[PDB]
Structure 1
Amino acid sequence: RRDWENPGVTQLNRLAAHPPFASWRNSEEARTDRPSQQLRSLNGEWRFAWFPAPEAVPESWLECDLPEADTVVVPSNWQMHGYDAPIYTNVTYPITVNPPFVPTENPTGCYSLTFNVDESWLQEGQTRIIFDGVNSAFHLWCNGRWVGYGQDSRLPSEFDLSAFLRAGENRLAVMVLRWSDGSYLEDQDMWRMSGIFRDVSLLHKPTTQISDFHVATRFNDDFSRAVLEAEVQMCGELRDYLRVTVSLWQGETQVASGTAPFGGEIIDERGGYADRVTLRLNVENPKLWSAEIPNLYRAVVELHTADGTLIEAEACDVGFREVRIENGLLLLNGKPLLIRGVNRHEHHPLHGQVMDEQTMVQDILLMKQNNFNAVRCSHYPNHPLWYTLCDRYGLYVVDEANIETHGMVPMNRLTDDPRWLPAMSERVTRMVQRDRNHPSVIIWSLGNESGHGANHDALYRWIKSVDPSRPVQYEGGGADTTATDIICPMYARVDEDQPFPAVPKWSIKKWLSLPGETRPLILCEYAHAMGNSLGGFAKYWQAFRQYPRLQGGFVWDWVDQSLIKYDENGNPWSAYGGDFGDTPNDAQFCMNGLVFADRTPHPALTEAKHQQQFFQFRLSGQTIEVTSEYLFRHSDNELLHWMVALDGKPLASGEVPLDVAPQGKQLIELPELPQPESAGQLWLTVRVVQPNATAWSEAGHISAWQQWRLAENLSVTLPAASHAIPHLTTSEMDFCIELGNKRWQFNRQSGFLSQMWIGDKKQLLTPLRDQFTRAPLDNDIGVSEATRIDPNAWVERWKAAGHYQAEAALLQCTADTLADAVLITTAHAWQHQGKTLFISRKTYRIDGSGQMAITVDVEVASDTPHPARIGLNCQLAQVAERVNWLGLGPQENYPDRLTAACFDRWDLPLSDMYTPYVFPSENGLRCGTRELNYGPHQWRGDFQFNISRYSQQQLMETSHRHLLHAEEGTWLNIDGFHMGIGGDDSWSPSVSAEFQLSAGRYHYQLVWCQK
């Protein structure tokens, strides 16, 4: 029948979808969500054999275990065990586009498991098996007998095993197909794996059972009163003595309880559902649920007899919250939301796509600690535990159907095809039937990148029909089609329009007011965090706050999809597309996260935390205006800590308790501040600290911060008169300056400071020369390849202009002696094939104080691509342990991504000045620095810089970070100016005009001396 090549057959003998069941036989246990004897786990060691195609599987395998098979762990992806290679492809399907057919060489995983079943389970009731996740299709045999078939890799497939099992030992045989017609609906930008990668369990239910139940909560005008409505459905034999009791608990305190026999109200001319019943419970002053305060209640559903005998119990956590769109705004419990969200794939560096509680909790904590309050299930229903955690920890979830047909041409070829409506409907309907009781889920999504087809409109309507409690969104077809209640574009920019044909990406501000538009706009994806990114992040947030209908978005995305491989000596390294022999592939585009695969933060995470703060501040005189962006909670676990410092020197600090109501304000006046001892700039820094621990944070957690320049006192006092005078020594080849223990050497042919001495030690490995380029960032590269060059990408424009091959032509080099110093003057012209790209004019003034003032003035041809930077560099001879500086820090920061950094005195080990992006590039920069100290060297001025053991050349020539090798000495890069990193997207120039080096003529000055 080749059921895996027919979208008309997505399952065989599969049981209906429903909310999480456990069939407790004790109510108290259901109330506490404790383990159930009726819900067993079959996770653990299984038998597994790999085959190249289903036709290669031996018939003996159904009856008897294969001796060639290995014992492996389940759940898991067999690619992670190395049976075959995992594939990373973005848009292009991993298989030939020829729906509904798949390759004949279809990797087949044969899993089997011998397990016990107690006679008590077979003597009464129904025993079903549940597969939470099987990629991508599979057939099922129990004791040699065929049971059923299933598709859709991201939702549970359940079958009734009652007629197949026997008391004692039993053997399951599961044949998993890597590819199937269902693969055409699973073209998400991520690794292509397969296997039984989610929990497998055994559930026993009484013959007469609770087959389904829906929990709803509607409120009155001010939410002071609510009604919990619970529709319960049963299967089995109807009897008058049967009853359904639904009780609601708030902790240990029972809040309400209701009981009733089956028999619903009249529905139509044929009557009503005799097998259903709706219980309604009133609740006064309910504790509302929100990401701010995740108050949860427990709903216990009991199926029993009128005499009081319990037959079975189910239950769920209930969160009293209302989600509705009104007058253009998405409201939660009547208040307009501000989505601080992120897209999150289920990815583990070692386990692939198998999730575990530990990892889920770790992601959630990091998210809430960094001011995220929402997550989007990109792009499929998640592991069931994920919704439980979000309910409890408090995160707004967008539940997304497992539907993506990005590779099709056009994108909606399948979604507009009625013969694919069935397969699509199951992926949407079975998702709703499974998660509709989770309060964390506030929005349903019809899928991702599948264009806009009629099937979308149909399913969009189906949801609005079955579940009115949640809005429905979908981005395909233009982000604003008839299949979405929310304008949810991906990578739409703040002010810049991208008028693509048929599916343009308008600036979000303009989008809201297009003629006739009135819906709220929340980007389903924005701020592509690939590599050194998130430049311009602060621009979205400024907009979200000013525009009521710009209600935020979900950053793309949470964690890099890098995998772990081992080298020749067992050393692990982060691998990406193509590193497994997988081809065609999309290399590093699988790494777009705010954190590395191991959950170690990327520098951009801190920018997100800052911009996403819940407290806004304003300064006026000595009064700080604190404004809360919370919608429901008072600042009951926050205190404001202020600190005034002069050029890094702490001059005064204090603490004030924060007592601000949601959306309210608090005025805090600072004490009379004492005038600073010397000259310099006074800086004010405030921080919001949570004194007490929470479920998601430790005591002392900093949730927000801000800075302001206070009084500045310009130094107007001339330094002491030098004692000695620098001596100049002109020679055919050099201009040497001597001053005590110091020696400066300027090569007259190159016109560069080729060397410096402090006593007997040389200070340079490579001369100090100008630099106008940088090792290409992922955003500089885009989709350009050696095979497919993108002339539009920044990297290509620089290469094409000769920026990386520019050779300096010495125009002038003269030496002059002053009354108290030696003045060296140079002028270089960088040219490429007769084109003068840049002209550098400098003057070095070495005085008796032993200081070398470097004054630089650059000219950049208006018709050459704006340069990546304008500074100097050199390979210092020394290698120190610490790096001390006065500027923006402590973490890496760039022009368009430095709002999170603060100005102060920072001190870090040299290694922290290097950001280990898997794909190497220019990194570690720190802007707005007035003083830098390394070893015996000190540079002063107003510049940005990066210092490490890796030269820009090595960084741009190396593909993986583990292949880098510390160079001799330390490479220093001091820039007077540096281009922005961009990041609105990573496949087209995204550096905003204000952050491009286009002034034409640049000036900057540095002073080098001993610390």
Structure 2
Amino acid sequence: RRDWENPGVTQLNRLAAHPPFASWRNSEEARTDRPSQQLRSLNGEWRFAWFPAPEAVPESWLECDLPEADTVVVPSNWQMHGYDAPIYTNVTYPITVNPPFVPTENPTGCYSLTFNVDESWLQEGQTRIIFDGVNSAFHLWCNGRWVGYGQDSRLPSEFDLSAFLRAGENRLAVMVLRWSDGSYLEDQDMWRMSGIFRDVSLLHKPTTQISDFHVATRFNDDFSRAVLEAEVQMCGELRDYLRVTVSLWQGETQVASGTAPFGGEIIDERGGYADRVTLRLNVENPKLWSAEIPNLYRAVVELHTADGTLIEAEACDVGFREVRIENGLLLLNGKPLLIRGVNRHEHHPLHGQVMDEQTMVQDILLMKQNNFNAVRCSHYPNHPLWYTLCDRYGLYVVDEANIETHGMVPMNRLTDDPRWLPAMSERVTRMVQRDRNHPSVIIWSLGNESGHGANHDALYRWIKSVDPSRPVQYEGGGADTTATDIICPMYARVDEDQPFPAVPKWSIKKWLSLPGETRPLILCEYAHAMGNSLGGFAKYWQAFRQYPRLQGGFVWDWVDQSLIKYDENGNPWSAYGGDFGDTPNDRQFCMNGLVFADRTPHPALTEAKHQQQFFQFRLSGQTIEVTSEYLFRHSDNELLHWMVALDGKPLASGEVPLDVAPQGKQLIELPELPQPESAGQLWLTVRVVQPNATAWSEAGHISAWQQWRLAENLSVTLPAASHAIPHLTTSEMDFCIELGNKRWQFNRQSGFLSQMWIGDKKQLLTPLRDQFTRAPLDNDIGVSEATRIDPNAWVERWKAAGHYQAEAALLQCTADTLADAVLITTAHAWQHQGKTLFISRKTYRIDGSGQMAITVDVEVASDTPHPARIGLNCQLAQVAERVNWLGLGPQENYPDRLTAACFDRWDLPLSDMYTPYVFPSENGLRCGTRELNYGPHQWRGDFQFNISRYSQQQLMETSHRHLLHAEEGTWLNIDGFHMGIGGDDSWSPSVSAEFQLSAGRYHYQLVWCQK
């Protein structure tokens, strides 16, 4: 029947979907969520064999183990074990588009397991198997007899094995298809893998059982009274002596309890549900659930007889909270949310798409630690434990159906086709059925990038109907269609409109007020964090805070989808699209996260943490005003530390308790500050510190900071005049300057500082020269490829204007002696095919003090694309251990991504001055630097710099970080000006005009000296 090439057959013999069950036979266990003897795990060592197509599978395999099979761990993705290649493609389907057909060569994973079943499970009751995740479709047999079939790789498929097992050993056989008609609905932008990748379990339920239960919590107007409503359904034989008891506990205290026999109220002319009952429990003063304070109760559902015998118990954690949209705003417990969100895929560099509790916990802790309060399950229902952790740790979740048909043309070709309604329907209804009792889920999503089709509208309504408790969103077809309660665009810019036909991306501020519009706006994806990015992040946050209806967004995305590969030497390396021989592929486009695949943060994470702070500050005088952005909690685990320093020299500091109500203000007065010892800028830095450990942070965790310039006393003190005067030596070839142990050499034919000596040591490996380019960031490159050049990308514009190829032409090189110094004057023109791109005019003044002052004035032709940078660079002879500077830090920071950085004195090992992005590019800059120290050198002024063992040239010629090799010496890039890095998206120019180097004329000055 080739059920896998028929969207009319998404399953065969599968059981109804339902919330997490465990069939406890002891109620106290159900109360405490302890392991149930009735829910067993089948994870571990299974038998597996790979075949190129289902037709190649031998019939012997149904009844007997194939001798050639290997033993492997389950769950797993077979690509991760090396049986075939994983493929990374973004939009284009990995298979020919010819629905509902799939290729005849269709990788087939034959899994089997021999396992025991105790007779006790078979004497009474029902034994079902549950496959939490099989990608993408499969047939199941038990003891050689066919049981059923299933699709939708991201929801559990359950089958009744009752009539198929026997006491003792039994053998399961699972034939898993890599491609199926379900693949047409699984076009997410991620690695394409397959296999039994989520848990496998066996659950015993009594014949008379709890088959479903839904929990709702409704409130009075001020939230001081709620009613907990639990609708309970059974399967099995109704009998008057049956009862259901629903009890509610807060910790170890029972808050309420109610019992009733089965029999629902009348629904229509034929009566009511004799097999259901609804219990209603009053709760006074409930402790409310939020991501700020995830208060939870425990609902325990007992099915039992009137005489008191328990049949079974099921249960769930309950979060008393209301979610509603009113007057244009999304409210949680009656207060408007400000979503500090992130999209997060289930990805692990070694295990592929297999998730584990440790990784889940690690992500959640980092998220909270970085001021995130919400996650979007891009773009499918997650492993069930995710929801439980979000309930308990506290994060708002957008749960999204596993439906994405991005590669179709037009994108809604399937979603507007009624023949595809059934399959889509199962992906939305089965999700709701499974996840509707989790308080962490606050919004349902109909999927991702599948255009807007009538199937969406029907499904949107179904949800609205079954679960009025949470809003429904969906971005396809323009982000504001009739299938979404929230305007939820992806990559809409703050101020700039992108009026694409049919599905324009309006500026978010403008979108809210279009004629007739009244919904809240929350970006489903924004601030594409690919590579060196997150430029302009603060512009979003400023807009979210000023506009009530701009309720935030989900950054794209949490973690790079890089995979580990091993070299000839067995050393691991981070790989991306095409590294597995996969083609076509979308290369590094799968790496867009705030963290590397191993969870090490990229530099952008600190920017997000700062902008997403929950405390806002203002300074007037020496009075700090702290405003809380929390909606429910008081600042009961926070103190404010303040420190004032003079050019990095600590002058004073203090601590003050913070006692701020949600939404309130606190005024703190700083102590009188004594006058500073010398000239310079005083800087105030404040930090919110949590003194006590929480479930998600260590004692001492810093959750917020801010800085301001205080008084500045400019220096007017004349410098003690040199006891020595430098000597110039003129030669045809060079101008040399000597001062004591120092010597400076300027080549007359190049017009550059070609060498410097300290004692008998040469200081340079390459001369000091102007630099106007950078090893292109992912955002500079966009969709440009050598085979498909995108002429609009910044990289292409620079390349085309000859910025990377320009050669310096000397216009002038002269020397003069002053009363106390030597002055070298140069002028160079960089040209390209007859065009003068830039002109650099400089003066170098070396005085009796040994300092070399460099003054630079650059002219940039108005008609050349604005350059990536304006600065100098050189390769120093030395390699030193530390980098010390007075400027913004400590982490990498760029013009449009420096708000999180603080001005102070920093000292790091040199390696920390290099950010190892997987795809190498310009990196490691630090801006607003007034003093930089390295080895015996010191540079002073007001510049941006980067320092590392890799030249810009090497960075731009290298595709993977693991192939980089340290150069001799150290590459210093010192810039007077640097362009923004952008990131609103990574496939179109996104650097805002204010961060482009369009001034035409630029001036900067550096002093180079000995430390």
Query: Unaligned stretches of 5+ in structure 2?
Result: none
Q: How far off is 1:381 after superposition?
A: 0.1
Deviations 1:852-879 (A, max 9, x none): 0000000000000000000000000000
Question: Per-residue CA shift, 1:684-720, capped at 9, x if unaligned?
Answer: 0000000000000000000000000000000000110
Deviation at 1:379, TM superposition (A): 0.1
The unaligned stretches of length 5 or more in structure 1 are none
Instruction: Give the Cα–Cα distance (whole angstroms) in 2 for the partners of residues 99 and 890 of structure 1.
Output: 53
SS at match of 2:266: coil
Report how far residue 10 of structure 1 moved.
Answer: 0.1
Distance 2:123 2:782 in 1: 63
Superposed CA deviations along residues 762-820 of structure 1, whole A, max 9, x for unmatched, are: 00000000000000000000000001000000000000000000000000000000000
User: 1:66 and 1:676 mapped to 2: Cα distance?
Assistant: 82
CA distance in 2, matches of 1:856, 1:674: 39
The one-character-per-residue Cα deviations of 1:709-743 (angstroms, maximum 9, x if unpaired) are: 00000000011011100000000000000000000
| Distance in 2 of aligned mates of 1:517 and 1:722 | 71
Which residue matches 1:580? 580
d(CA) in 1 for partners of 2:963, 2:718: 50
CA distance in 1, matches of 2:497, 2:632: 36
Cα deviation code 1:578-636 (max 9, x no counterpart):
00000000000000000000000000000000000000000000100000000000000
Give the whole-Å Cα distance in 2 for the aligned partners of 1:171 and 1:93. 36
SS of 1:363's partner is: helix
Task: Give 1:420 deviation, angstroms.
Answer: 0.0
- TM-score by length of structure 2 reads 1.00
Cα displacement (A) at 1:358: 0.1
In structure 2, distance between residues paired with 1:387 and 1:453: 29
Which residue of structure 2 lines up, in the alignment, with residue 474 of structure 1?
474
Task: Give the deviation of 1:322 after TM superposition.
Answer: 0.1
TM-fit CA distance, 1:40: 0.1
Q: Deviations over 1:324-366 (max 9, x none)?
A: 0000000000000000000000000000000000000000000
| Partner SS, residue 85 of structure 2 | coil
Task: Work out the CA distance in 1 between the residues paired with 2:121 and 2:216.
Answer: 33
Alpha-carbon deviation of 1:988? 0.3
CA shift at 1:112, angstroms? 0.1
Q: CA deviation at 1:199?
A: 0.1
Tell me, in whole angstroms, the C-alpha distance in 2 between the residues paired with 1:305 and 1:1010: 89
Task: Write the distance in 1 (CA, Å) between the matches of 2:41 and 2:353.
Answer: 19
1:741 is the counterpart of 2:751: no
| CA shift for structure 1 position 317 | 0.1
Shift of 1:248: 0.2
Post-superposition CA distance 1:92-138 (Å, at most 9, x none): 00000000000000000000000000000000000000000000000
Q: How far has the Cα of 1:159 moved from its partner?
A: 0.2
* Deviations 1:64-88, CA, capped at 9 Å, x for gaps: 0000000000000000000000000
Cα deviation for residue 668 of structure 1 reads 0.1
Structure 1 position 305, deviation (Å): 0.1
| C-alpha separation in 2, matches of 1:791 and 1:568 | 38
**Alpha-carbon offset, residue 531 of structure 1:** 0.1
Residue 253 of structure 1, CA deviation = 0.2
Q: Distance in 2 between matches of 1:629 and 1:980?
A: 29
Tell me how far apart the structure 2 counterparts of residues 376 and 674 of structure 1 sit (CA, whole Å). Answer: 50
How many residues align structurally?
1011
SS at match of 1:469: coil
1:295-337 deviation per Cα after TM superposition (whole angstroms, max 9, x unaligned):
0000000000000000000000000000000000000000000
For residue 991 of structure 1, report the CA deviation from its aligned partner: 0.1
1:999 shift after superposition: 0.3
Q: Give the secondary-structure state (helix, strand or coil) at the position aligned to 2:271.
A: coil
Match in the other structure for 2:1008: 1008
Q: How does 1:277-292 map to 2 (within 5 A)?
A: 277-292=277-292
Secondary structure of 1:871 counterpart = strand
Q: CA deviation at 1:231?
A: 0.1
CA distance, structure 1, for counterparts of residue 833 and residue 315 of structure 2: 76
Cα drift, residue 751 of structure 1: 0.1
Deviations 1:22-57 (A, max 9, x none): 000000000000000000000000000000000000
Summarize deviations over 1:490-522 as a string: whole Å, max 9, x none.
Answer: 000000000000000000000000000000000
User: Once the two structures are aligned, what percentage of the paired residues are identical?
Assistant: 100
- Is the counterpart of residue 214 in structure 1 residue 214 in structure 2? yes
Cα distance in 2 for partners of 1:475, 1:172 equals 41
What's the CA shift for 1:451? 0.0
Give per-residue Cα distances to partners, 1:249-268, cap 9 Å, x unaligned: 00000000000000000000
Distance in 2 between residues matched to 1:865 and 1:9, nearest whole Å: 56
Local SS of the residue matching 1:953 = helix
Distance in 2 of aligned mates of 1:450 and 1:151: 19
Deviations 1:416-465 (CA, angstroms, capped at 9, x unpaired):
00000000000000000000000000000000000000000000000000
Corresponding residue for 2:116? 116
SS of equivalent to 2:746: strand
Alignment pair present for 1:698 and 2:698: yes
- Spell out, residue by residue over 1:934-974, the C-alpha distance to the aligned partner (whole angstroms, 9 max, x if none): 00000000000000000000000000000000000000000
2:842 and 2:723 map into 1 onto residues whose CA distance is 26
The offset of 1:377, in angstroms, is 0.1
State the distance in 1 between where 2:70 and 2:721 align. 83
Could you report, residue by residue, the CA deviation over 1:271-315 in whole angstroms, capped at 9, with x for unpaired residues? 000000000000000000000000000000000000000000000
Cα deviation for residue 532 of structure 1 reads: 0.1
- Give the corresponding residue for 2:362: 362
Aligned-partner Cα distance in 2 for 1:470–1:170: 44
Which residue number corresponds to residue 940 of structure 2?
A: 940
How many Å separate the matches in 2 of 1:241 and 1:590? 58
Give secondary structure in 2 for the equivalent of 1:656: strand
CA shift for structure 1 position 269: 0.1
2:789 and 2:261 map into 1 onto residues whose CA distance is: 71
| Cα deviation 1:654-708 (Å, max 9, x = unaligned) | 0000000000000000000011000000000000000000000000000000000
Displacement of 1:896 in angstroms is 0.0
Once the two structures are TM-superposed, the CA of residue 180 in structure 1 deviates from its matched residue by 0.1
- Give, in whole Å, the separation in 2 of the partners of 1:786 and 1:68: 45
1:243 shift after superposition: 0.1
Return the alpha-carbon distance in structure 2 between the equivalents of residues 788 and 413 of structure 1.
27
Name the SS for the 1:267 alignment partner: strand
CA-to-aligned-CA distance 1:632-655 (integer Å, 9 cap, x gap): 000000000000000000000000
SS at match of 2:768: strand
How far 1:909 moved relative to its partner? Answer: 0.1
Match of 2:24?
24
- SS for the counterpart of 2:696 is coil
Provide the C-alpha distance between the structure 2 equivalents of 1:834 and 1:421, rounded to a whole number of angstroms: 62
Query: Aligned partners of 1:569, 1:877: CA distance in 2, in Å?
Result: 31
Q: Kindly report which structure 2 residues correspond to 1:30-41, keeping only aligned pairs within 5 A, or say none.
A: 30-41=30-41
The structure 1 segments of at least 4 consecutive aligned residues displaced by more than 4 Å after TM superposition are: none
Q: Deviations over 1:153-192 (max 9, x none)?
A: 0000000000000000000000000000000000000000
Q: Partners of 1:640 and 1:428 in 2: how far apart? A: 47
Residue 528 of structure 2 aligns to a residue in which SS? coil
Deviation of residue 20 (structure 1)?
A: 0.1
1:88 and 2:122 aligned? no
Query: Which string of whole-angstrom CA distances, capped at 9 and with x for unpartnered residues, describes residues 210-253 of structure 1?
Result: 00000000000000000000000000000000000000000000
How far apart, in 1, do the equivalents of 2:833 and 2:806 lie? 9
Root-mean-square deviation (Å):
0.2
Q: Distance between the aligned counterparts of 2:163 and 2:781, measured in 1?
A: 59
> What SS does the corresponding residue of 1:247 show, helix, strand or coil?
strand
Distance 1:572 1:555 in 2: 29
The 3-state SS of whatever aligns with 1:299 is strand
Q: How far apart in 2 are the matches of 1:561 and 1:11? A: 30
Residues 806-861 of structure 1, C-alpha deviation per residue, up to 9 Å, x if partnerless? 00000000000000000000000000000000000000000000000000000000
> What is the rounded CA distance, in whole Å, between the counterparts of 1:568 and 1:94 in structure 2?
29
- The structural deviation recorded for 1:207 is 0.1
